[PDB]
Amino acid sequence: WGYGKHNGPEHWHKDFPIAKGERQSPVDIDTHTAKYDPSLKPLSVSYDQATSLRILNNGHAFNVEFDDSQDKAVLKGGPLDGTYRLIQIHMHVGSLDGQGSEHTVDKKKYAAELHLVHWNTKYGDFGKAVQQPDGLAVLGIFLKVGSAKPGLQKVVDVLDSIKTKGKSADFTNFDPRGLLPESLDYWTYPGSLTTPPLLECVTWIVLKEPISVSSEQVLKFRKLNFNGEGEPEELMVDNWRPAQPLKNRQIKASFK
């Protein structure tokens, strides 16, 4: 699978029929029909002793991997029951400023969407968690052009190292706290992974406030390649799956 004409989102269902399931992601978040839930506990993001490991271009995105062997960088509270361990961070980006995000707000698309993937500790590990309807919790954060984001610059500075599919680099000492906006107000609903296998295991927590990135950072994030080294260059842009039917799901908001 990929994002091109012959292996993109429209072809996914053939190998992963769950693509046409009852709780696929992303979805459009209609801000008016979203149900404020005053009973949600505040979301707790404890990235305090996160332990980043490596960054890799797997041909679909850059992916910062973390040590999830014990409770280091976790997500709790909010709609979450239990504790969720951060395992990875990757980005969906567009070719133009008005596209790139997977989730949309009242049909509006952002220039990019960062996904911070967490798994439920009551399951043992990531592989086990993805066999559970509540095994993952993914934190989605929109990116809009504005001032440079220091936390993203860390990534920006290593992009040439991992330009093509299969290249990886050491990425220890990266503090994922620098990728978060001031406000933790969010929308939440039960969904899926947005890339094959598209498993329906996730509690999505999409932050209302996007983080800003400079025009220079955005351009650099669009310089990665989908292709492997030595093959014809295919810039890694528009690596996003479109909004999926919401079916009978309800999106809740943590704010009024």
Binding residues vs Zn ion (CB under 5 A): 115, 194
DSSP H stretches of helix in 29-187:
126-129, 150-156
194-229 b/e with 16+ CB inside 10 Å = b? bbbebbbbbbbbbbbebbbbbeebbebbbebbbbee
Min CB(191)–Hg ion separation in Å: 11
Going from the C-alpha of 123 to that of each of 54, 63, 120, 200, the distances in angstroms are 24, 23, 6, 15
CA 196, 198, 201, 203 torsion: positive or negative?
positive
Output the CA–CA distances (angstroms, integers) from residue 27 to 227, 232, 242, in the order listed: 28, 33, 8
User: Which C-beta is closer to Zn ion: that of 23 or that of 115?
Assistant: 115
- Which residue, 92 or 149, is less far from Zn ion as judged by CB? 92
Q: How far is CA 82 from CA 48, 74, 145, 155, 192, in A?
A: 18, 10, 35, 30, 19
Candidates 66-74, 141-149, 171-179, 194-202; binding stretch for Hg ion (CB under 5 A) = 194-202
Nearer to Hg ion, 51 or 121 (CB): 121
Pairing of strands 62-66, 84-93: antiparallel
Single out the segment in contact with Hg ion by CB under 5 A; choices: 5-13, 102-110, 115-123, 191-199. 191-199
Q: Residue 43 binds which entry of Hg ion, Zn ion, none, with Cβ cut-offs from 5 to 8 Å by kind?
A: none
Q: How far is the CB of 239 from Zn ion (least distance, A)?
A: 9
Using the minimum distance from each CB to Hg ion, give the nearer residue, 201 or 207: 201
Q: Name the β-bridge partners of 253.
A: 36, 187
Contacted by 115, from Hg ion, Zn ion, none: CB < 5 to 8 Å by type:
Zn ion
Question: Is 115 marked as binding a ligand?
Answer: yes
Place of tokens 């991997």: 65
Q: Which is nearer to Zn ion, 104 or 194 (CB)?
A: 194
Binding partner selected for residue 87 from Zn ion, Hg ion, none, CB under the kind-specific 5 to 8 Å limit? none
Four-point Cα dihedral 99, 130, 21, 62, nearest 10 = 20
32 is catalytic: no
Q: Where are the beta strands (DSSP E) in 127-201?
A: 136-145, 168-170, 186-191
From the candidates 13, 32, 60, 118, give the one annotated as an active-site residue: 60
Nearest residue to Hg ion, scored by beta-carbon proximity: 201
**Among the listed residues 29, 50, 179, 201, the single contact to Hg ion using CB under 5 A:** 201
Per CB under 5 A, which region of 29-37, 63-71, 114-122, 200-208 contacts Hg ion? 200-208
Give residue for tokens 């029909």: 33
Residue 195 marked as a ligand binder: yes
Task: Give the residue numbers of the binding site for Zn(2+).
Answer: 90, 92, 115
Enumerate the active-site residues: 60
Residue positions forming the annotated binding site: 90, 92, 115, 194-195
Binding-site positions for substrate: 194-195
